[PDB]
Swiss-Prot record, chains A, B:
This is Major capsid protein. Disulfide bonds: none annotated. It comes from the Viruses. Signal peptide: none annotated. It comes from Enterobacteria phage N4 (Bacteriophage N4). Assembles, to form an icosahedral capsid with a T=9 symmetry, about 60 nm in diameter, and consisting of 535 capsid proteins. It is found in: Virion. The chain holds residues 102 to 151 of 401 of the full protein.
């Protein structure tokens, strides 16, 4: 039913159009830490704990 | 739920810790013996019993 058919003498019969689509992404930040005291590393039995 | 996330100013946000474990083992002592006489060696049928 929807085939583009052209007459012997044709003008302005079939037109087409186009579109475009956009996509996106984002960024985030993470982190964590830990704490200690000098006495802990100084009096500990195991050297090289850090 | 428990992911570490950061804002621009991150103060005292995520903290962690650590642990260690110890193992052990010991030793023991075993032994047994036997005894004989001189006649049992001198008068026996075959030499090389020892």
């Amino acid at each position: 039913s929807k085939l583009p058919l052209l007459t012997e003498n044709g003008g302005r019969v079939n037109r087409v159009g186009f579109t475009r689509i956009a996509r996106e992404g984002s960024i985030h930040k993470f982190g964590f830490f830990y704490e200690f005291t000098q006495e802990s590393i100084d009096f500990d039995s195991d050297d090289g704990l850090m």
